Amino acid sequence: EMEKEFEQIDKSGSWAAIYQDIRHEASDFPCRVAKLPKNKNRNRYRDVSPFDHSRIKLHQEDNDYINASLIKMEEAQRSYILTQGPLPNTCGHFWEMVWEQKSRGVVMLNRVMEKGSLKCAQYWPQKEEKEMIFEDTNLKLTLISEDIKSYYTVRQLELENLTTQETREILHFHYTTWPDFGVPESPASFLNFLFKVRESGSLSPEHGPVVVHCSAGIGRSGTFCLADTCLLLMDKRKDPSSVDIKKVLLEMRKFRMGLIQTADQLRFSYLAVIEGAKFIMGDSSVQDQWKELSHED
Ligand SMILES: O=C(O)COc1c(C(=O)O)sc(-c2cccc(N(C(=O)c3ccccc3)C3CCCCC3)c2)c1Br
């Protein structure tokens, strides 16, 4: 049971060991396509690749490769696409993927510049009047509006397939204060953001999988997805005790390597799930408490 386990790990100060055990047991599958010479410039990090078996394929004859994985959580009945921060040459691919996969939401957990380096290309328009066209994939992207809070911003985007003139609304959820290799300020501020994404309808099975990324698409992204899936599993069963967090993380790691980068991110995942469980089990008041504690305004 998660809460008892949490206290036992804390008391014995063994988060590092628990986390390393997960690294040790984690799945290992080939990433041969990602490692092809022709794809070298499509990868942000040499050592972070999608497994072949779960990679997202772009629907183009030329090169179907993008550094992105479909995390398909069978029991939870929710899917996520985890991906790296797009590069200057893969922003067209990124939006092609969003289009083809019918995603309604994009969750961004990093800033474009972190610790002096460019962790992500500027892949969305920052001004209404300066829309972006991706010539390679024939897509147009327009900023429609944005709602800026103290630590996150929600943007409304219009994605147009120039080939069909079909348009879709994409919601962009941008968490701006989550440190690389770090954790959110609090469970409250994390859960407040997660519930914004949930309340948008972006996670509905009627849409394609939400796209989740940070810089490498594994650390912060893995933390976000683990917490969401655990809360969803608990919700479907109305039984917080039935959820084995480490087992869920290991399942997710079948679909993308390295999910959750540090022991404290793992510890933080417990914190968020334990706190979120309050809402799941019928304490609706905690949601406004998180909002307040998060200092949105
Ligand atoms: O989102 C976060 O919290 C941190 O995200 C990340 C980065 C960033 O935002 O700059 S860079 C990054 C990354 C890139 C390449 C390799 C690795 N991996 C490491 O063990 C590692 C960790 C720190 C420094 C160098 C390597 C291994 C290599 C084997 C596969 C798993 C990761 C990690 C991650 Br992850």
Side-chain angles (χ1 to χ4, degrees), residues 73 76 78-80 190-191 194-195 197-198 203 210 212 221-235 248 252 269 272-273 280:
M73 300 308 284
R78 182 165 291 166
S79 280
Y80 317 81
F190 171 81
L191 288 160
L194 173 60
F195 274 57
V197 179
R198 289 178 154 220
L203 304 180
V210 66
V212 184
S221 292
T223 307
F224 176 92
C225 296
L226 180 62
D228 183 59
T229 297
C230 286
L231 289 166
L232 174 62
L233 284 169
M234 177 185 303
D235 202 7
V248 175
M252 298 182 55
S269 293
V273 175
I280 299 306

Side-chain angles (χ1 to χ4, degrees), residues 23 45-48 114 117 119 178-182 214-221 257-258 261-262 265:
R23 285 206 164 166
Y45 302 108
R46 190 193 67 190
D47 293 344
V48 183
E114 300 182 329
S117 69
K119 298 301 206 61
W178 191 335
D180 56 291
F181 297 90
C214 37
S215 189
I218 61 177
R220 289 170 282 186
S221 292
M257 64 172 66
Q261 227 330 103
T262 83
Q265 289 179 343

